[PDB]
Design brief:
1 chains; 1612 residues; 51% helix; 7-stranded antiparallel sheet; alpha+beta; part of a larger assembly; 58 helices; binds manganese (II) ion; Lymphostatin; toxin; Virulence Factor Lymphostatin LifA Conformation II; 36 strands
């Protein structure tokens, strides 16, 4: 290994030198160097070819390095810190302090006192009262089927006790009894009472922080709290007096105690330190978690969990709790051991150590020994303990207690260890009640970061809007602050008044374990069995080779934890019912000042109630103008940025033009509501991931693994690996020039080409993987093009690339690191059964290796692998689909609350994206500054001119320009991110996006920026992460844990290869069943039946879930109608876009893309929900049960799922609306009729039953019903941003143009703009949306396809036909579209309009039917085993059966393979109808005009085909023509005339029909027959030949559309 490891050997020399050149080796940097060289030695020994001598040398080097690390120890500062809980009686405290001052001679006792939080207990009690009352109100209102006895009794007791406020104890005891009653409530109700209470309290805390923002205060005190209370609840003077009395009493108590102890021990010996004098308290990243802890705490008599951390970090020394006692000395413990005849029960039993410690306390402080509480102790033990105390009371006060070791290892915090004799055995655990550390310790930083992360995870309940409520997770000691358990603890404490911990000893132990693991090799002695070891604690008692532990000479001297005043000891006595309580009536809450919990509109009558007269008379007019727009913005289901910008800008201006305080508060409430709305409306994300690899690392295994994982996560994901060749080329030139400063070209080119070709070939067979060259999609005038041209090399270039590719239209998730899809809940549940929560993250790489690839390793049990193979890969991983981002259009990965640029999730196509434009402009400005600095020609005035007319000028401050000029003079060539950092003082452009937004969104943007300092997530941060880093498997979200809260797996619905319907023939399904649908609905009692069939999804993938969920969002008739119209419009647009292959305007295209992305995300989410029993209750189909649900259990919405389809049942108003996406909806008076109709509809009709998936199946066991426990669950699951599909009627370009009444003059004639757009008027390759100016009129062009469709749909007047012919003649047909022959364009008179319309309708119907017929023929022809080539060559067709359309088709395959069976009754039945109506025409006064026209069209199409004279498709079309001819011959040739032509017979029949009944119908029939008799028109044959020659080859469509176009040609 001396060759490969040679260079690293050089490295080790240098690290040794770094060890040698250390002024202070006892420092962090030296230890870092030590771990670096230890890891290098690890790398050396990991090589397989290592001799035994090298192993021994490495081992002794490791031992020496470990000894050197362990020798570097720090002597802690001589301080002792104790936190004074406001509610602490000094008589029980002072003694302990004296003890700690009599043994620790050279130590100063600092009592940390928070003067401004003396009254905070009452404030949090009032907040808790309000939150619980709100939770009770919402529970009662959300479950109106029954009244709750808990709520009734609770309101009863509160209201009754209002009479006697002085009876607090009477109230608290009755509340304990109330909790005893509450324990018997239903478990789902308990879960809702646990989620609500917590969410409401977090909301109230956030409201208080918002008030702190609006008052512009910097530090929070009691006066601020009292003013907030008076502004949120009516406060009388009595409660203010109570608050002040508590504050004064606390001040007097603390001053008296400190004065007494200072009189005894001296001035400087014991002192008071103010809590507010800590830098960490006001630190922004601590997020004011100290204030939040004051509210979310259940350990009342205990001290704060976060203050001790700050104190240890900023001061160092020893932190102790009040009731800790110094450990017993060696001599005293030895003597008590020998004086009790060897009975160790005295040194283990808690109830006895309590009495002994009480006696020692009384002796040390010269108090009466005989007064020791001796209860629950027998007389014999009492007497022996009495003699014990009398014997110890002779020993020198000095030799009664011991001290501890104040020399601790550098950057380590010892933690006391506690041993307890429970009845079940020995309980050993670490305690945060006694810590050692030193100032500037770094493990304290890790613990503080962990505490902040824990509070973030706790707040995740309210942060995540679409977060589930009902997870019945069992108690598992999860690292997650499991929200349900914490809410339960909080409710229990609020009700009764007296385990799990957010930031207790458990979290501290976890964080120290993680940090010591991160330390590396040298920490191996601080971790044992992947857990905290015995050397990370103090007080560890080694066992004496037996069951019990020897109490003489412990490994480390501890602290007497057991004391008569332990928090869990005296609490049997103190009732604590007055120190921390404030009973305030909540019914008088002022809802208008609470935007978090109540969304209110501008009620102009009551809004200006507390405003002063002058502010009213100045600003009321402007507010009244704002009223309607602001209410519209709030009530909208989408966010339009123009109105938001206008409203917010003018609200901010109004705020700036005011000096009041109440009106300022109301306007700030409006801004808060706006910001919350911005937070709520999330937009979907496209199923696209774009990885920008760094093509220089030695291994690409991570890239392949990431691509495989994202391919396996979902079968529709699109993956784009964007690499740039110019960037690599310029990097090569830069390396060669740097080498030249102080041959390989072919090697480098081969290396890059080989890597790119290898990644291309590994995923060659997958179409979803696209290897892209970035310098092939960017415009030449773009900033990136200039960056490549100049030779930009700086490492941030790729980040810029990402931003550019988002502005180019490439949406999705852009990333550089090799992301992996997050593991689903199923994989985690599988892994949990054989692993703990801390090993799952370690074993996940092996599981992913087994899922994506097929490798297995012995490090994982076989049963795990077998369980993993039983599930599909897409059921174990989370795909990119189903995600959502902020409406501002960009989200970023988070790292401890700071958003970074590892992952950029950029909205969805078609949605508004302001950040795109902002970053585009910013990148341009940075480029301009960079280029002007490149030549050194930048000065202050130029810098001002560059950024004018730009938002980035908001960063133009004097210090920023000064720094920019200084850095420009120091080094002219700086990367764009360096320019950004100089200009703004921000780390990343992601941080600058919000500041750029504030320009156009002032006030709201500033508010959202200010909320980041107060616990609220950044608005541009993704919360739920579906990705994990490949090297550490940590989610990239803000407040998520991938292990304990992994997302549920989504069920994927897979359908058969053959599609029963395609887009062309889909309307057949609606047409043939609509009438029977209506008849069934009307016969089952329906009174309102509406038909709005959908055409968005013609296949059953997703079981039409998406659409159904949309119909489930509506709660009102009006919203339902608006949604129905919008959906019909989008469906028509879809048919126009893809069935006809017609271009659309930009607005319509964006609307279609928005609706489609929303539908796909909704379908994914719905399919995920229905399969997970924790969220929606699923029941088998039973009419009585469902009626009981809809009548008794208060269920208002339900999803009825068949195997292949989904129906929606609602309870709008007082009627039950059953919605079928393919058939519209029906309205029923009672649920039972709706259920009967659903049963009949899905059961009776055979084609319906087969298509829905219920053929030959019992409907009582294959139809499921999914419903919610409470209606609010739907409000929690369904997204709020509908893209306006439910509130506002989206308008297509045609509707907008139809409103304009000004005509446009083209080619000398004037026609309306709507008609000009209809005929396909395009400017430079884009359909017009506005009246063209006179200059652009010559540039207009006519789209051939749109004009052809318009002609085939419209019955023009002769004058209009002349106008269109003239316009086409003077403008021409746009190149690449369908050429149109002017002879085709004609017009009809008034009397022949109905006939022409019916003919066009029949043409469409025949197109749709023949499409299905030809698909059937292709399917029948493809299942025939065919050898090499396409020589099927149908020998002979013959019509066999007359009633079912049986055609015997001999196939002359050459191998005598003959399939004489096919069922095509659509062709035969029309001719049967025509013949039977012709024969009985003299005896029937009925004439079917539509049937005649359809038959005429079919025979004309067959004539064109056969006159025109070798794969499956064209052969099947020729076969179809043959069967049309044969059926006509069979039905119209009554006698066997050899000289029989179908056209002549059909024409003669039409002529006889026309001559039997006169009129315009007869004239039209005669004209059709006349056309049939004569030879085909020259122009007709010309257009047919032109199509079949050039147009079919030009188009890439399948063959069905070409056949439909030909039959349309025939009908025209
Ligand atoms: Mn305690």
């Amino acid at each position: 290994l001396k060759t490969k490891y040679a260079n690293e050997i050089i490295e080790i020399k240098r690290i040794m030198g770094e060890y040698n050149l250390l002024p202070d080796k006892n420092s962090r940097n030296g230890l870092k160097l030590l771990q670096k060289q230890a890891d290098l030695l690890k790398i050396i020994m990991e090589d397989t070819s290592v001799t035994e001598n090298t192993f021994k040398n490495i081992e002794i080097a490791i031992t020496d390095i470990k000894r050197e690390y362990y020798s570097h120890t720090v002597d802690i500062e001589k301080n002792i810190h104790a936190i004074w809980v406001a509610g602490s009686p000094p008589e029980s405290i002072s003694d302990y302090i004296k003890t700690f001052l009599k043994t620790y001679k050279e130590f100063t006792y600092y009592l940390w006192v928070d003067e401004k939080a003396f009254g905070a207990a009452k404030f949090t009690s009032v907040l808790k009262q309000i939150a619980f009352d709100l939770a009770c109100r919402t529970i009662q209102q959300n479950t109106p089927q029954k009244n709750i006895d808990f709520i009734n009794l609770y309101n009863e007791i509160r209201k009754k006790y209002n009479n006697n406020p002085s009876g607090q104890q009477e109230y608290l005891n009755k509340l304990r009894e109330l909790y005893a009653t509450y324990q018997k409530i239903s478990t789902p109700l308990k879960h809702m009472f646990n989620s609500f209470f917590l969410e409401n309290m977090i909301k109230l805390q956030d409201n208080f922080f918002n008030y702190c923002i609006v008052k512009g205060v910097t530090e929070i005190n009691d006066e601020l709290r009292i003013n907030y209370l008076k502004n949120v609840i009516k406060l009388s003077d009595d409660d203010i007096g109570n608050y002040q009395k508590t504050i004064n009493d606390n001040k007097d108590r603390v001053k008296k105690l400190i004065l007494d102890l200072q009189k005894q021990f001296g001035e400087n010996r014991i002192s008071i330190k103010d809590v507010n004098s800590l830098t960490s308290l006001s630190k922004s990243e601590n997020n004011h978690n100290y204030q939040t802890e004051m509210l979310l705490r259940w350990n009342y008599p205990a001290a704060s969990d976060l203050l001790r951390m700050y104190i240890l970090k900023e001061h160092g020394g020893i932190y102790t709790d009040t009731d800790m006692m110094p450990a017993y000395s060696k001599q005293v413990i030895f003597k008590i051991m020998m004086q009790t005849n060897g009975d160790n029960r005295f040194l283990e039993d808690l109830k006895l150590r309590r009495a002994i410690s009480d006696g020692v306390l009384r002796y040390v402080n010269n108090q009466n020994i005989d007064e020791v509480n001796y209860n629950e102790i027998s007389d014999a033990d009492k007497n022996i303990i009495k003699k014990i105390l009398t014997e110890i009371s002779k020993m020198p006060e000095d030799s009664i207690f011991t001290k501890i070791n104040t020399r601790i290892p550098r950057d380590t915090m010892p933690i006391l260890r506690r041993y307890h004799l429970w009845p079940d055995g020995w309980n050993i655990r670490g305690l945060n009640g006694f810590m050692l550390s030193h100032k500037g310790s770094e493990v304290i930083d890790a613990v503080i970061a962990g505490q902040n992360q824990a509070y973030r995870e706790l707040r995740r309940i309210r942060d995540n809007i679409h977060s589930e409520i009902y997870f019945k997770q069992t108690d598992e000691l999860s690292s997650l602050p499991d929200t349900d358990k914490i809410g339960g603890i909080l409710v229990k404490k609020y009700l009764s008044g007296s385990t799990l911990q957010i930031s207790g000893p458990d979290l501290i132990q976890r964080k120290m374990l993680q940090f010591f693991r991160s330390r590396g090799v040298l920490g191996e002695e601080f971790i044992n069995e992947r857990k905290l070891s015995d050397k990370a604690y103090i007080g560890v008692y080694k066992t004496t080779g037996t069951g019990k532990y020897d109490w003489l000479t412990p490994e480390s001297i501890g602290v007497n934890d057991v004391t008569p005043a332990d928090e869990s000891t005296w609490c049997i006595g103190k009732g604590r019912c007055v120190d921390d309580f404030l009973f305030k009536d909540v019914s008088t809450l002022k809802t208008e000042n609470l935007p978090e919990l109540f969304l209110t509109k501008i009620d102009t009558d009551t809004f200006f109630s507390q405003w002063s007269t002058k502010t009213k008379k100045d600003l009321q007019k402007k507010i009244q103008d704002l009223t309607v727009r602001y209410n519209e913005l709030i009530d909208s289901s989408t966010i339009d940025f123009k109105n938001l910008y206008e409203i917010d800008q003018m609200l901010h201006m109004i705020m700036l033009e005011m000096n009041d305080d109440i009106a300022k508060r109301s306007l700030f409430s409006l801004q808060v509501q706006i910001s919350e709305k911005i937070r709520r409306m999330t937009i979907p994300v496209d199923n696209i991931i774009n990885i920008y690899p760094d093509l220089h690392k030695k291994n690409d295994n991570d890239l392949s693994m990431s691509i495989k994982g994202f391919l396996a996560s979902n079968p529709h994901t699109k993956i784009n690996i964007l690499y740039s060749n110019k960037t690599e080329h310029n990097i090569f030139i830069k390396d060669l020039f740097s080498f030249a400063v102080m041959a390989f070209f072919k090697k480098h080119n081969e290396n890059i080409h080989n890597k790119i070709q290898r990644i291309k070939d590994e995923f060659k067979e997958y179409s979803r993987v696209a290897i892209h060259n970035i310098d092939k999609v960017i415009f030449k005038g773009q900033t990136l093009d200039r960056l490549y041209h100049e030779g930009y090399v700086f490492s941030d270039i790729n980040t810029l690339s990402r931003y550019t590719l988002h502005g180019l239209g490439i949406t999705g998730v852009h990333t550089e690191e090799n992301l992996l899809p997050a593991p689903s809940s199923s994989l985690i549940n599988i892994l949990k059964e054989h692993y703990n929560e801390d090993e799952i993250s370690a074993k996940l790489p092996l599981a992913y290796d087994y899922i994506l690839n097929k490798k297995e390793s012995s490090s994982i049990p076989v049963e795990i692998l077998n369980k993993l193979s039983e599930l599909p890969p897409h059921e174990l991983l989370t795909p990119v689909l189903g995600q959502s981002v902020n409406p501002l259009g960009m989200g970023y990965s988070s790292d401890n609350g700071k958003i970074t640029e590892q992952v950029i999730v950029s909205g969805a196509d078609g949605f508004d994206n302001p950040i795109s434009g902002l970053i585009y402009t910013y990148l341009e400005d940075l480029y301009n500054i960079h280029v002007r600095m490149r030549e050194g020609t930048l000065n202050s005035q130029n810098l001002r001119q560059l950024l004018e007319n730009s938002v980035s000028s908001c960063f133009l401050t004097e210090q920023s320009i000064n720094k920019l000029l200084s850095e420009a003079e120091k080094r002219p060539y700086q990367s764009l991110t360096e320019i950004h950092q100089h200009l703004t003082g921000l780390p990343t452009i992601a941080d600058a996006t919000l500041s750029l937004l504030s320009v156009g969104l002032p006030g709201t943007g500033k508010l959202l920026r200010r909320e980041q300092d107060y616990g609220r997530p950044p608005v541009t941060a993704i919360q739920d992460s579906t990705f994990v880093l490949p090297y550490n498997f940590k989610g990239i979200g803000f407040n998520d844990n991938i292990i304990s809260s992994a997302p549920v797996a989504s069920s994927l619905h897979f359908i058969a290869e053959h599609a029963k319907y395609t887009l062309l023939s889909w309307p057949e399904f609606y047409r043939h069943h609509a009438q029977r649908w209506f008849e069934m609905a009307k016969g089952y009692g329906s009174q309102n039946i509406d038909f709005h069939p959908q055409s968005l999804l013609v296949t059953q993938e997703g079981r039409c879930m998406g659409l159904a969920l949309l119909y489930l969002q509506t709660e009102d008739t009006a919203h339902y109608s608006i949604l129905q119209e919008n959906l019909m419009t989008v469906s028509a647009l879809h048919q126009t876009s893809n069935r006809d292959k017609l271009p659309l305007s930009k607005d319509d295209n964006s609307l279609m893309t928005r609706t489609y992305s929303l539908i796909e995300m909704l379908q994914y989410q719905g399919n995920k929900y229905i399969t997970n029993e924790s969220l929606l209750h699923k029941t088998a189909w039973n009419q009585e049960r469902i009626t009981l649900l809809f009548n008794e259990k208060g269920v208002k919405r339900a999803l009825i799922s068949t195997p292949n389809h989904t129906l929606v049942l609602q309870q709008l108003e007082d009627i039950y609306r059953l919605t079928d996406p393919n058939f519209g909806h029906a309205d029923f008076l009672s649920p039972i009729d709706a259920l009967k109709f659903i049963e009949a509809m899905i059961q009776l009709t055979p084609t319906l039953q087969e298509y829905y998936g219920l053929l030959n199946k019992d409907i009582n066991k294959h139809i499921q019903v999914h419903y919610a426990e409470s209606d609010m669950v739907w409000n929690k699951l369904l997204p709020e941003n509908d893209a306006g599909l439910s509130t506002r009627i989206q308008h297509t370009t045609t509707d907008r143009l139809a409103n304009l009444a000004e005509p446009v003059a083209v080619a000398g004639i004037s026609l309306p703009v709507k008609t000009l757009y209809d005929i396909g008027a395009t400017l430079d390759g884009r359909r017009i949306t506005s009246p063209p100016t006179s200059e652009q009129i010559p540039s207009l062009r006519l789209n051939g396809d749109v004009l052809n469709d318009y002609l085939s749909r419209t019955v023009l007047t002769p004058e209009q036909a002349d106008n269109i012919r003239k316009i086409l003649h003077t403008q021409g047909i746009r190149s690449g579209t369908r050429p149109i022959d002017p002879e085709m364009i004609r017009g009809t008179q008034d009397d022949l309009v109905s006939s022409q319309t019916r003919l066009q309708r029949q043409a469409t119907r025949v197109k749709q039917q023949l499409a299905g017929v030809l698909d059937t023929l292709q399917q029948h022809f493809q299942n025939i085993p065919r050898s090499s080539g396409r020589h099927l060559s149908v020998e002979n067709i013959e019509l066999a059966d007359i009633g079912s359309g049986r055609f015997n088709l001999q196939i002359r395959d050459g191998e005598t393979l003959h399939t004489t069976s096919v069922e095509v009754p659509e062709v035969v039945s029309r001719f049967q109808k025509l013949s039977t109506m012709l024969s009985a025409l003299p005896a029937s006064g009925i004439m079917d005009f539509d049937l005649g026209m359809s038959v005429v069209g079919v025979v004309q199409y067959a004539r064109l085909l056969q006159q025109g004279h070798m794969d499956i498709k064209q052969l099947s079309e020729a076969t179809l023509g043959s069967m049309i001819q044969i059926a006509g011959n069979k039905f119209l040739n009554t006698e066997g005339i050899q000289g029989f032509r179908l056209e002549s017979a059909v024409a003669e029949g039409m002529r006889s029909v026309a001559t039997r009944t006169g009129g315009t119908m007869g004239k039209a029939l005669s004209a059709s027959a006349r056309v049939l008799e004569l030879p085909v028109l020259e122009t007709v044959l010309g257009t047919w030949n032109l199509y079949n020659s050039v147009i079919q080859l030009q188009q890439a469509t399948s063959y069905s559309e070409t056949m439909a176009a030909r039959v349309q040609i025939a009908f025209d």
